[PDB]
Amino acid sequence: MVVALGLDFGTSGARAIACDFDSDRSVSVSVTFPKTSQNWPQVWREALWQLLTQIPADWRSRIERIAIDGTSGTVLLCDREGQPQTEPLLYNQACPIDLADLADWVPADHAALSSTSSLAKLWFWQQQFGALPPDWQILAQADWLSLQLHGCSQQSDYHNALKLGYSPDRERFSKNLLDSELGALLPVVHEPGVAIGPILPAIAQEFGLSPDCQICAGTTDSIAAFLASGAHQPGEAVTSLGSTIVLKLLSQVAVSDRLTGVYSHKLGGYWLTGGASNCGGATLRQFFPDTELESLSCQIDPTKKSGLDYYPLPSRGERFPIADPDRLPQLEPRPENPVQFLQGLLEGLTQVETLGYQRLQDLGATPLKRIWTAGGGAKNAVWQQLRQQAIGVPIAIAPNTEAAFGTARLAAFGLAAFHSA
């Protein structure tokens, strides 16, 4: 019944989606980020006000809850007032630090043990600033942007906080990390979806929002994209068939594998696990454009195996399901008819998804029940036939894939659906 606002801040831009879930009606507005900037916080915040502005007044007067998802790993170093004291470290930027320095702050093989993690970037900043002031704070993109709305400093969610060192399984930072030099900069971690506080009165009156509107705890954009699908039962999974095949499986058990980068986000009483293969649509685009890809797909009969057996790597190295930094793209033997060649490629990608989900299950995750598909290859029915014959479960196109929609659902209902009974 709630009318909720989902704010999505991703890699290339930002999208706002407001939904009346009672009548199931929505409105969506967009803003495109520059290719690069000199003041990214300014870009993000201006994008925030711009998004709020593009939303109709009749909608804004009825928004009761707001949630924000941001890119994972994009952090900001700020004072007490939330003002950036240096350039933000982006999601894709790595830091040349020694992970052994973070050994006594998180358990072994923790997800925060990565050169691109928020914790590694915090330690990074600590190195060049020498001594970070105790009254300062580190804030993920979503954290900072929501801070622009509710004004409560040092507030984050246990999705963004995971790679900062948070342990969602025991729902805490280690006492070693809390009593460390970085502990004073750490945020208070809440569950994604819960109310942090009311919206700032000035902001509410300025943008014609209700002064009783609640600003909720945020999440990451990939998780929000998963939330867009609506899947909330263990064994349900979302497959993203984009440039790279990305699997996300909902399970009752947290599974992990550091060699393949597999970890688990907490999701209510459940866990969202998954992985990412280097194979994907990019390998297909190496041979055919999209139009030719379709033109050939319409001639493929998935019932009869091509006989070919490819591993559709586009380049050097494979992460998931099996880790091999020196594995070759096996796109041989390439045959006569490009139709059966494309069929072979599709069979390869199919095997990638299959081995992926089966491997996820083998690590202890809840057995697969069904697949919701997103990305460019989602509409490919032949590919879907190969997949749904190889996996063993029903496969359908995800009703919604927009991160902003999943974030709007996060604002409206939180993670309440992700519990036993």
Ligand SMILES: O=C(CO)[C@H](O)[C@H](O)CO
């Ligand atoms: O750049 C992005 C990733 O898609 C943002 O989510 C933006 O909303 C674009 O739609």
Ligand SMILES: O=C(CO)[C@H](O)[C@H](O)CO
């Ligand atoms: O948040 C991120 C973690 O790599 C990326 O920006 C990506 O957009 C995820 O969907």
